[PDB]
Amino acid sequence: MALSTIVSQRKQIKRKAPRGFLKRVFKRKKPQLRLEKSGDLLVHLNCLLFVHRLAEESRTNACASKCRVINKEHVLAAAKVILKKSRG
């Protein structure tokens, strides 16, 4: 397999969430706030549904152009629609 193209992951990694990473990123951007102890988990849930949306939309664009490999112009087009939809 070439370095440039990565094959689809057959097995998903353990469903454990990076709780420490979410706390720091939320901390640096808005230092003044304090987040509840379980609020980190719900943010992780919100991020999953975003990535799930992004993967579906990218696949449709690649199939529409009759391409077997997801390309950068396919996913950037996916980003514009999902990012606006993801904000409410």
Binding site: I6, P18, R59, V69
Partner: peptide
Amino acid sequence: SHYVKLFSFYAKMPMERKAL
């Protein structure tokens, strides 16, 4: 890197490195 790997699981297609 956690969410990027999870992206490739849902895509179910080979995906170019530049897309990562």
